Design a protein around this ligand. Structure first.
Ligand SMILES: CCCCCCCCCC(=O)N(CCO)C[C@@H](O)[C@@H](O)[C@@H](O)[C@@H](O)CO
Ligand SMILES: CCCCCCCCCC(=O)N(CCO)C[C@@H](O)[C@@H](O)[C@@H](O)[C@@H](O)CO
Ligand SMILES: CCCCCCCCCC(=O)N(CCO)C[C@@H](O)[C@@H](O)[C@@H](O)[C@@H](O)CO
Ligand SMILES: CCCCCCCCCC(=O)N(CCO)C[C@@H](O)[C@@H](O)[C@@H](O)[C@@H](O)CO
Ligand SMILES: CCCCCCCCCC(=O)N(CCO)C[C@@H](O)[C@@H](O)[C@@H](O)[C@@H](O)CO
Ligand SMILES: CCCCCCCCCC(=O)N(CCO)C[C@@H](O)[C@@H](O)[C@@H](O)[C@@H](O)CO
Ligand SMILES: CCCCCCCCCC(=O)N(CCO)C[C@@H](O)[C@@H](O)[C@@H](O)[C@@H](O)CO
Ligand SMILES: CCCCCCCCCC(=O)N(CCO)C[C@@H](O)[C@@H](O)[C@@H](O)[C@@H](O)CO
Ligand SMILES: [Br-]
Ligand SMILES: [Br-]
Ligand SMILES: [Br-]
Ligand SMILES: [Br-]
Lengths: 90, 92, 90, 92
């Protein structure tokens, strides 16, 4: 369970690094620094305005942004559900 | 578990085909090709702006669009829960 | 499991009747007939724009609308989760 | 299971008190009294417009508001899942 939380932190930090690099210049309010990026990716994980509010406006500049977000959603919104269920069984 | 993923892909591809045909001309930004349709239906599945952002604007042109989306939501937002639980059991 | 689905249909139909009566005149696009009401309450159940998009605009006319929606959400977004989990265990 | 519901009520009431104090003057429609605050925090819990609709506009005045909401979400959107699962087990 602890190793799952360690995996998620590593995946969340690396994805927030990638997004800062990728969309930081074009979308500075959402990904202009590591902080804004970790915040945005937590919101994207909770699925709040992920497509309409974030990903569709991004894809308008970077047409392949879905290659990042869709797997990011699928990975985190699974590992989070796995980590949370893990403590419930314990 | 693998058969569940195979079922979802088939259902997702066929639904994305149907939507492209149905709403592609009237709503081309959301369903104008298979790609835009698979993207939109993934978002509809995640329940993000499904009614306000997508389905209500669609229903304004096609009043019966709910016959497509509501069952699509009920089917996928169950099969996804079934597929994800399936791998979890494959550990215990 | 079947009795759970029968309970939800009864609760969903009665709540859609109540909403048509309560907010049908003031909010006719969302609750102007039984059909629009069953549609809106399915969306409210999925939690999509429930507060910002629906309930906050309603509460602006009917300040106690939260006495309807909040319990409706708590009841359905539990019974649905119970009904769906029921078949998974079977 | 009952102790879980008692824990959530205490956490929900104290969080609604904190928010009224913190953002009540700057954001009075959402946190201007305890009532508006308990309503907003129920919506924040359900994840409805939490960031775009509530937290991002708040952070524009209080840049650290995420220190309140993010843990609040993590705590409630876990304790609610724990409380709901608790009654389900009390049958099997
Ligand atoms: C799952 C792990 C989730 C971790 C989430 C951490 C989010 C951090 C958000 C954040 O810090 N910012 C987002 C901005 O949108 C930047 C500013 O809020 C911050 O820099 C200020 O506090 C001051 O330093 C400057 O005013
Ligand atoms: C559960 C399964 C989830 C499947 C998700 C698949 C999403 C595919 C989305 C997609 O391919 N596009 C979305 C468009 O909205 C179009 C892209 O091909 C885009 O790169 C185009 O713009 C190019 O022509 C280059 O400009
Ligand atoms: C780390 C989890 C998310 C990993 C996702 C990796 C996708 C790689 C994205 C990419 O290379 N381009 C997208 C350009 O937008 C180009
Ligand atoms: C899984 C899709 C399930 C689709 C169910 C049938 C849709 C029929 C198309 C229709 O009449 N509308 C527009
Ligand atoms: C969990 C159970 C969920 C059941 C959901 C059923 C929703 C039915 C929605 C509905 O029928 N309408 C919603 C309108 O917003 C009315 C119109 O769509 C309908 O009357 C048209 O099909 C034509 O008759 C007139 O053009
Ligand atoms: C998990 C626990 C969930 C608790 C949810 C409690 C919600 C309570 C919301 C509430 O009381 N109001 C929301 C306001 O946004 C104010 C009402 O008292 C309203 O009726 C007022 O307008 C009156 O003064 C009459 O006009
Ligand atoms: C059937 C499930 C939902 C049952 C909820 C019942 C609430 C009753 C609402 C009410 O009487 N007024 C709200 C006025 O807006 C007055
Ligand atoms: C459960 C709430 C958890 C709240 C955690 C502390 C919040 C401190 C208040 C703050 O600095 N911000 C604005
Ligand atoms: Br998903
Ligand atoms: Br559902
Ligand atoms: Br809830
Ligand atoms: Br979470």
């Amino acid at each position: 369970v602890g190793s799952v939380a360690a995996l998620l932190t590593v995946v969340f930090y690396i994805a927030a690094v990638m997004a800062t690099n990728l969309y930081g210049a074009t979308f500075p309010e959402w990904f202009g620094d590591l902080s804004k990026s970790l915040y945005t990716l937590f919101q994207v994980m909770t699925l709040e305005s992920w497509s309409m509010g974030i990903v569709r406006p991004v894809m308008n500049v970077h047409p392949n942004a879905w290659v990042f977000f869709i797997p990011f959603i699928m990975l985190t919104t699974f590992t989070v559900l796995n980590l949370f269920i893990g403590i419930i069984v314990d």
